[PDB]
Structure formats: structure tokens, C-alpha cells
Amino acid sequence: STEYKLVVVGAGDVGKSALTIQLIQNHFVDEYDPTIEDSYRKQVVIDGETCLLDILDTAGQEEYSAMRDQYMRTGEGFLCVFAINNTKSFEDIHHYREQIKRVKDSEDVPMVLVGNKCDLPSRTVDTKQAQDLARSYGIPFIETSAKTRQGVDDAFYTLVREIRKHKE
């Protein structure tokens, strides 16, 4: 099987830890420690190929030492996560993409835009608004809901396909 190192980036409280557990453990955690950054592993099948994933749930203080960049440079794909009910988290996407392009030293890094918390009624970030931003980036965009499993597995598998295309 092929290994894929994934990194989940995004502002705080957007659902990175909830999305990560919903894919690994297949259940929703409504209150995970926001200061905890850990790595998870699970082997799934993606369009026939068996894929072993190592997903990094990022958290903690924003810091750009050579050790941190080198550790973040090990990620092959990135999930830039925002909340459809938090405008600021959607404006901070340009920050994470810019920092990912810097440490990876490339302008075509495999990544997928994630609009989490789509199960909530009041939405402030429009769907087509985030869709045109991902179209400008040239990256996929998927709306997910860690509570209802909606698109969770879809968002993660789409990122592995972007890595597959970039590799070949």
C-alpha cells in the first residue's frame, strides 16, 4: 500500500479535530481539547488503491521556526478548513495557503478547500463564494459536516487524489 501524509490546517474552532476523528473513528466529538496537536493513522481504499494515511491535526501557537517549517514540509497534502458560519476563518484561508506554498517551495501544492459545519442553518460564507476562491486556486472545494459525516470521507479522499495526480 501507498502512504500519504496529510495535514489539516485552519483557524481555531472550525472543526479540524472533529473532522479528523469523524474519519478515523467514524464518530463526532463535540468538545476536543483545542490545544492538542496529534497524529492519526488509518488505511482506507481510494478508487481501488489501498492507501495508508497519516493525518496531522494541527493546533497550538502560530510559529515559523526552521524546525516547525521542516516538520510542516513533511506533509504531502493539506486540508484548509474553515467554518461556513465564521467569516474570519474563511478570510484566513489565504494565510494558510500562502504559508503552505512557502514551506513547500511550490505554487501547485495538493490541497482541498473544506467548508465545515454545513449542518448549521445560518450560513455567512456562501457556497459559490468559496467555490470561486478554490477555482482561482485550482484546488477542489468540498463542504463537510463532522456531526453528520457529510462529505468527511469525500474531502479526505479528494486530497489523496490530488497527491496522486501531482506525483505522476
Ligand X SMILES: C=CC(=O)N1CCN2c3nc(OC[C@@H]4C[C@@H](F)CN4C)nc4cc(-c5nc(N)cc(C)c5C(F)(F)F)c(Cl)c(c34)OC[C@@H]2C1
Ligand Y SMILES: Nc1nc2c(ncn2[C@@H]2O[C@H](COP(=O)(O)OP(=O)(O)O)[C@@H](O)[C@H]2O)c(=O)[nH]1
Residues in the site for Cl ion, rule: CB under 5 A?
Answer: 63-64
Question: DSSP state, 78?
Answer: E
Q: Is position 44 an interface residue for ligand X (rule: CB under 6 A)?
A: no
Within 13 Å, how many C-alpha atoms sit on residue 9's CB side? 24
Please report whether residue 153 would count as binding ligand Y according to CB under 6 A: no
| The C-alpha cell that represents 113 in the structure block | 478547500
Per CB under 5 A, does 59 bind Mg ion?
A: yes
User: Contacting ligand Y (CB under 6 A), which of 117, 143, 151, 163?
Assistant: 117
Query: Least distance (Å) from ligand Y to the CB of residue 117?
Result: 4
Task: Establish if 76 lies at the interface with ligand X (CB under 6 A).
Answer: no
Residue 89 in grid coordinates: 476563518
- Distance, CA of 6 to CA of 9 (rounded, Å): 10
Q: Which residue number, 100 or 159, has a Cβ lying nearer to ligand X?
A: 100
Based on its alpha-carbon atoms, the radius of gyration of the chain, rounded to whole angstroms, reads 15
Secondary structure (3-state) at 142: strand
**Interface residues with ligand X (CB under 6 A)?**
9, 12, 34, 58-59, 62, 64, 68-69, 72, 92, 95-96, 99-100, 103
